[PDB]
Symmetry: D2
């Protein structure tokens, strides 16, 4: 009776950072549930390729720029008449952003611009279309580091995601009687081919992290995709302002199982 | 369709409210539902509607909880999903000043002991299978306190939350996820009528709910289907709040 | 001009489980700040010894019994005039309560009786005195395990402390306009001479726990005593319903420092 | 005597919570360095506390470094840092009505400032092998509101997350880092305003179990606790002093 293949039928979803990682996994999952996907990404090559795969739309965007972000959402609304879903997901974690002791202001500010400012811009743009429409679901990518701190610190990254979480929560409360939901996706660490190789080459480094993850592994991007589809859908109609942790138990755990 | 195709789900308190709505939703995704309930009349009717199995149970008794899961497993071969959901909120459990020991203990027996029994029995079956999803019904009151207190109820749900979290951590490498469903207040035809005849009482609660309304049982059912499924494969030990923004809000929108 | 040796001058404090551990350390600290301490404990030998050291009063009590708990607080109020502070701290962690697979009902229920029912009884009794007096500060001992789960589980203990936390929070909210504050003390693991010897002999068992504690050690009971003195005092006048974590950073930490 | 001899740097120390905290730390024996943007009120606060005023814009790296370097060269060390400077300007409001200059200004003064202040404080505390840092976040880092100041809220969420991480990171170097999260704080201005507009007051107070805003002295008491050895097993804390706000559904009458 319940077919998930039409859960997002006819819904227009904008995804930033959509050409890779959880952004691309999410694009595939929303498309599989019937959504029309607008891929916004800084890379025109991988961006075009993603949109082609999803039978969707590519708009090039630097999410740290107000004009680019407005253009993304405005192009989406002009093309399809509406924006139903916004997955405000673009973010970076560059090597120059590290321990507070060795992280200088250019690194600090660049990460804020691309990770926190971008979410302010993206929410403002999405709301410009969603509010007069009387409906919408916004998912902002924060992180489990918005709730849990680490000795292996990337200090501007951590602050930016804390900012994303608190802003997401407030927006969710603010717009809760205007037909809109806003939620913060807080992923645990996410697996990549590069990490899989690195962890195999350095078991000590891997174990230093895995000992704090009850499930004993990083997330696959498809697992985050499943959560965004849930939040984007009417299955999450009573969920707004959420600290939506998909972290394999990290935030819940003291001593982990063997 | 068929996110839960072939899966066997045991639901306690499955004959009413969230339990019943969840039964319907899991069935719609392909699950076989075993309805465990103290009420044989509504229990049989729910199982008949879901094309499932009704099994009498008193969730406060070890023999009965063990028989519920044993019967589900012997009948269908396995228990994939346990929604340990049965609970009460009797009027004799109220403000701590007026709440006496019989009421205190009855609520602990039915709401907290029951989840220990149900998880112990579910795990007996799930651990050798190497897979399972357990959803325990706590409450948003495990996270938020209220002046309109039912004190044993609140303590029991805090206990459910903490135990759920720990079981989730403990079994995370044995293929079994454990999560605490924490609903906000749930709507009923009765509450809908009461709130209409008494807008002051309604407002006193609704002013703390951003969405401005109680949940529908179907909305909790949607969350349990998510948690029961592989869509939540990286979610365990969760304080899974489905509360319309209650735990997140200071000043609410008009 | 701030002298803490007078912060609780004349205040009457009832401490359950006052003969040992955190309870005893807290008695010393409250007394050092000028309080009159009523030591409620099941053990008359250590109970009397504590009250003698604290220049206070020992009152025998089984905190799992309504009559005994009512007698403890009624005796404190009759003997010293009032109950200003209640530190509802008595609790047990017996070995028969362990992993859920191996934990039978008598152990389950015994821990619920002594750890959770006891806090209901103790709060109900303290409030009988504090409400008419229009003032009071109640501190209930929960645990960091009310917030964080462990694979090394004592399942009834954990449930009991989750129950204590939620009840404390609700009581704190409920009585916030009646001159009373109620807060949950949530200690991390606390050190003992026994534990220090056990960890020295068994570095493996030790590191399995310490790797999740940013401070790198268990708490000393005096550190919890200092938190209770704060919560009992007017220095915590705007703190009620708190999940008051004194846990060396456990609930906050992913990867810990070396 | 709890803070006898300890040197405490307080940004925003010339008014509000910063000033109340200066008085409390002094009353426990601390030496207070008042870092503030206004020299006249700054010197006034320092003179009262028998401390030292250092002029500083906490959004400037060179000025923040000078603040902590001057504290260390004058009194030998920095034992306590209360990184408390922040603003809540009206230009920062609902997200629909908040432009980029307003957004960025609040991030600069509220969040960047805490990164700069922590970097400088830690640089001094690490050699000493001891120190206690208290960063002022807010209860809005934990609870959202429809009456939104969106950059402020974001900045304070950032302050909380960064405080938590630093507290974890430095926990085995004898340093503690904690986030003070105050509820709404009373002022004479607010007090008169809530009298003239009781409907406005009621809209907020119905979410506060204690039924009032905090007095700055109450926050000062919490900072003194965190600054002291009484909080030696507390680090990385979301230290809520919010009258029960983050804990409450239906509030008492
Ligand atoms: N361990 C993790 O990967 C992890 C964990 C938790 C949260 N997150 C967050 O999830 C989001 C994506 O994670 P991911 O693993 O998929 O990373 P990813 O590198 O695989 O994807 C990031 C995408 O964003 C694009 N992008 C980068 N800068 C951009 C800019 N200015 N404008 C527009 N697009 C830009 C990139 O081209 C890239 O396609 C990030 O916000 C990340 O911080 C990641
Ligand atoms: N506002 C809410 O309804 C709300 C909010 C949060 C959490 N919860 C919790 O959700 C769960 C379900 O709530 P609901 O409103 O749907 O309840 P409900 O009263 O509508 O139906 C629950 C079922 O539990 C059955 N039951 C009662 N005692 C039993 C026992 N000893 N053994 C076996 N079955 C028994 C009842 O016969 C009934 O069919 C409960 O645990 C509740 O505490 C409810
Ligand atoms: N690692 C830890 O020690 C730790 C951590 C977090 C929370 N806690 C909790 O802190 C509280 C105190 O812990 P502790 O380590 O200081 O205990 P303790 O064993 O060192 O002291 C025991 C005291 O409690 C008394 N007691 C036991 N049962 C009693 C009963 N029915 N009635 C009256 N008194 C009774 C004992 O006789 C004694 O007076 C407990 O509730 C504990 O669960 C402990
Ligand atoms: N309701 C509240 O007041 C409340 C609640 C929670 C958190 N907070 C936060 O507590 C902290 C202090 O609050 P307050 O009420 O005492 O504010 P306040 O306005 O009374 O004091 C702020 C001080 O900081 C100074 N200052 C401003 N900008 C500066 C700059 N660039 N560089 C150096 N100094 C500067 C000011 O001169 C002033 O003395 C702030 O961070 C605030 O956001 C306030
Ligand atoms: Mg990176
Ligand atoms: Mg009821
Ligand atoms: Mg023990
Ligand atoms: Mg302002
Ligand atoms: Zn850990
Ligand atoms: Zn509220």
């Amino acid at each position: 009776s319940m077919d998930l293949t039409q859960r997002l039928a006819g819904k227009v979803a904008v995804i930033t950072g959509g050409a890779s990682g959880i952004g691309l996994a999410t694009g595939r999952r929303l498309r599989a549930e019937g959504a029309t996907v607008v891929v916004g990404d800084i890379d025109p090559t991988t961006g075009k390729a993603a949109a082609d795969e999803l039978e969707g739309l590519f708009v090039p965007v630097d999410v740290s720029e107000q004009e680019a972000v407005d253009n993304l959402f405005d192009t989406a609304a002009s093309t399809f008449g509406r924006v139903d879903i916004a997955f405000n997901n673009a973010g970076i974690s560059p090597p120059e952003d590290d321990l507070i002791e060795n992280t200088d202001l250019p690194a600090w500010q660049r990460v804020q611009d691309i990770n926190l400012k971008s979410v302010y811009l993206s929410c403002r743009a999405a709301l410009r279309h969603m509010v007069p429409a009387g409906k919408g679901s916004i998912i902002n990518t924060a992180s489990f580091v918005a709730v849990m701190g680490s000795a292996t610190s990337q200090i501007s990254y951590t602050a930016s995601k804390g900012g994303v979480l608190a802003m997401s929560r407030e927006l969710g409360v603010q717009y809760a009687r205007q037909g809109i939901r806003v939620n913060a996706l807080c992923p645990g660490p996410v697996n990549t081919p590069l990490l899989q190789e690195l962890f195999a080459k350095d078991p000590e480094r891997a174990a230093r992290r895995l000992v704090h993850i009850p499930l004993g592994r990083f997330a696959e991007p498809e697992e985050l995709a499943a959560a965004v589809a849930f939040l984007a859908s009417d299955d999450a109609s009573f969920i707004t302002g959420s600290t939506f942790l998909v972290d394999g138990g990290i935030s819940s755990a003291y001593v982990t199982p063997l």
